[PDB]
Design a protein around this nucleic acid. Structure first.
Ligand SMILES: Nc1ccn([C@H]2C[C@H](O)[C@@H](COP(=O)(O)OP(=O)(O)OP(=O)(O)O)O2)c(=O)n1
Ligand SMILES: [Ca+2]
Ligand SMILES: [Ca+2]
Ligand SMILES: [Cl-]
Ligand SMILES: [Cl-]
Ligand SMILES: [Cl-]
Ligand SMILES: [Cl-]
Ligand code: NA
Ligand code: NA
Length: 326
DNA sequence: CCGACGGCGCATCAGC
DNA sequence: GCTGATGCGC
DNA sequence: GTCGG
């Protein structure tokens, strides 16, 4: 909360550039500025002070001078007062509706939750489920429930094959007291970088969790990534638990460390870590870290035995999951 | 109309 | 069907 | 919008 005023300001501007201006690179620049400011251990006193930080330029500095002097920003005042910009921004909050669909919908006079409910014929399956659970999906998950959820998934996976190993990642793994959704990393010795010895490895797991009624709906589903919905069982004369988003990712067993690094996040941390790589002369994805060369073609994968190894290649020193909340 | 800016899975469309 | 783009998602 | 070639 040290500089919460300023970081809240820049996050709002970011959300506007992404969802309204359709300017993904201005969105990324605002989020980077908010992030570097959030890890700064002093209270900012002027724009000039701010401009010293990497990712803060002439324009963001003038905006900080205005906020510090007046407690608000005229630019954001007007944006808030623009009903068209507000509707576009709101619609993107539904799972499956992005900037293009939101602007299309608003150009067509659809701009409220009610408007979507009576125009479902304009929505695809993904968007309909996002609508169904919109309230449920706005809510966060107390760590106590994340624990119950973890116990169910691990027990059912084990009943399918004792050789599976399931790991809960994302903000949960970063130690957060509440999470936005559940992310499950899955491995099995049958699936490696070399060969796919077992068919429907992901399918057998999804199908058992559906059989005991933990997973309730599917958003998308392929050979390695499941995106859907789940719910804990409740007691009689007891309010139902909210439905929750769940993501499952089957990663080759020999690529577990790059996988868990990617799946732990946070997102801006990943963006910032992969950017440092590029100027260190490497490129990191969820499968490998590689060195690059003169034609823009990446080299062979480098050896990896832990998460620390990846930090090493780029001369960052290790950071516990709880310190990756950039 | 300096141009890059992190990287990719799944679903769908344009022009073959 | 393909390749290459787009759109939304992690 | 920021930075750097
Ligand atoms: N643009 C993104 C979004 C996500 N991720 C990775 C890092 C995230 O931690 C992980 C899961 O994404 P989530 O949206 O579930 O984000 P979190 O778990 O970190 O936060 P929370 O679910 O609490 O909102 O995927 C990423 O690399 N790039
Ligand atoms: Ca999550
Ligand atoms: Ca997630
Ligand atoms: Cl942009
Ligand atoms: Cl303001
Ligand atoms: Cl690895
Ligand atoms: Cl790869
Ligand atoms: Na700067
Ligand atoms: Na959305």
């Amino acid at each position: 909360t040290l500089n919460g005023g300023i970081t809240d300001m820049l996050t709002e501007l970011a959300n506007f550039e992404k969802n309204v201006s359709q300017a993904i690179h201005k969105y990324n620049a605002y989020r980077k500025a908010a992030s570097v400011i959030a890890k700064y251990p002093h209270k900012i006193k002027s724009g000039a002070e701010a401009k010293k930080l990497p990712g803060v330029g002439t324009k963001i500095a003038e905006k900080i001078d205005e906020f510090l002097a007046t407690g608000k920003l005229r630019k954001l005042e007007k944006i808030r007062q623009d009903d068209t910009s507000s509707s576009i921004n709101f619609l993107t909050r539904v799972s499956g509706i992005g900037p293009s669909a939101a602007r299309k919908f608003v150009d067509e006079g659809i701009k409220t939750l009610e408007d979507l409910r009576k125009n479902e014929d304009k929505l695809n399956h993904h968007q309909r489920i996002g609508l169904k659970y919109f309230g449920d999906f706005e809510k966060r998950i107390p760590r106590e429930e994340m624990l119950q959820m973890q116990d169910i998934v691990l027990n059912e996976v084990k009943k399918v094959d004792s050789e599976y190993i399931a790991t809960v990642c994302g903000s949960f793994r970063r130690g957060a007291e509440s999470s936005g959704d559940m992310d499950v990393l899955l491995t099995h010795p049958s699936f490696t970088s070399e060969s796919t010895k077992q068919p429907k490895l992901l399918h057998q797991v999804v199908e058992q969790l559906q059989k005991v009624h933990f997973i309730t709906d599917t958003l998308s589903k392929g050979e390695t990534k499941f995106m859907g919905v789940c719910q804990l069982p409740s007691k009689n004369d007891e309010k139902e638990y909210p439905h929750r988003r769940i993501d499952i990712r089957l990663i080759p067993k020999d690529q577990y460390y790059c996988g868990v690094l990617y799946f732990t996040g946070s997102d801006i941390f990943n963006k910032n870590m992969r950017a440092h790589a590029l100027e260190k002369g490497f490129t990191i994805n969820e499968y490998t870290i590689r060195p690059l060369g003169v034609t823009g073609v990446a080299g062979e994968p480098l050896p990896v035995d832990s998460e620390k190894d990846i930090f090493d290649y780029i001369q960052w020193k290790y950071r516990e999951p709880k310190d990756r909340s950039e």
